[PDB]
Design a protein around this ligand. Structure first.
Ligand SMILES: C[C@@H](CNC(=O)c1ccc(S(N)(=O)=O)cc1)Cn1ccc2ccccc21
Ligand SMILES: [Hg+2]
Ligand SMILES: [Zn+2]
Length: 258
């Protein structure tokens, strides 16, 4: 009865309504560093978020999304393994109920406390709706979060969570700079995959950053006080909204560094 991350409608049940869940290029996957192939022909990533227009933040019952104005080429991603220009449309997180779990992708079986997804769509296709119908329609920039010192750029996001506590609530969120959530280095692994939540469409080129960002115990704690439920329903904490690693099948993970 509409997907979730619970015992009764969680990841292992998604295949009943979304048959593609057992396909050939499903995400997330485990990054085995010793089998990733160094590819010297990969180009440096090109992140241009200087004219980024954030609009609002909302709780959709699965996670919280900060949306951006993508009517024009304001914030894009170019280079790396990409072909063409991809527009930033929204970013969201996946997190756990404990510091030792949260991320969707793992590195050599190791799980991080959470994972950030910056979602972009191929401008060649006109609009997001069309992009989700093509093999190279999306580009998701994934960043891992580990518990340590505080991250300044994340605090503004943390402060407003109280106003979007339950399903369906939103709040205006203008003038937010995404550049405050990037690690120093832009080295990455890349592979062809899918969305990690229903519809689970196989239209994504995944770009996972090697270097994770640090956030405090207090910062992640705040994420854990959100609700899956809308106002007036019984309370169900929003935690562990992540999908388990899927088999790689016949794909190869390419690294941009040695
Ligand atoms: C795609 C959904 C919207 N979902 C996403 O855009 C999305 C983006 C990134 C991730 S993640 N975590 O992999 O980065 C997950 C979801 C709408 N929608 C629902 C049914 C549906 C059918 C056709 C087209 C769009 C449709
Ligand atoms: Hg697709
Ligand atoms: Zn995601």
């Amino acid at each position: 009865h509409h997907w979730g991350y619970g015992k009764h409608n969680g990841p292992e049940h998604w295949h009943k309504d979304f048959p593609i869940a057992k396909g050939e290029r499903q995400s997330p996957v485990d990054i085995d560093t010793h089998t990733a192939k160094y590819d010297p022909s990969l180009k440096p990533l090109s992140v241009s978020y200087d004219q980024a227009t954030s609009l609002r933040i909302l709780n959709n019952g699965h996670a919280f999304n900060v949306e951006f104005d993508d009517s024009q080429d304001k914030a894009v991603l170019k280079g790396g393994p990409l072909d063409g220009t991809y527009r930033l449309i929204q970013f969201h997180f996946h997190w756990g109920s404990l510091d030792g779990q949260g991320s969707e992708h793992t590195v050599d079986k190791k799980k991080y406390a959470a994972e950030l997804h910056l979602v972009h769509w191929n401008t060649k296709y006109g609009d997001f709706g069309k992009a989700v119908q093509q093999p190279d329609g999306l580009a998701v920039l994934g960043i891992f979060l580990k518990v340590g010192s505080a991250k300044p750029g994340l605090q503004k996001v943390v402060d407003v969570l109280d106003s979007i506590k339950t399903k369906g609530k939103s709040a205006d969120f203008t003038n937010f700079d995404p550049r405050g959530l990037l690690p120093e280095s832009l080295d990455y692994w890349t592979y062809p995959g899918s969305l990690t939540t229903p519809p689970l469409l196989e239209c994504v080129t995944w770009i996972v950053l090697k270097e994770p960002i640090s956030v405090s115990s207090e910062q992640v704690l705040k994420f854990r006080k959100l609700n899956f439920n809308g106002e007036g329903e019984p309370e169900e904490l929003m935690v562990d909204n992540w999908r388990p690693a899927q088999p790689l099948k016949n794909r190869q993970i390419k690294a941009s560094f040695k």
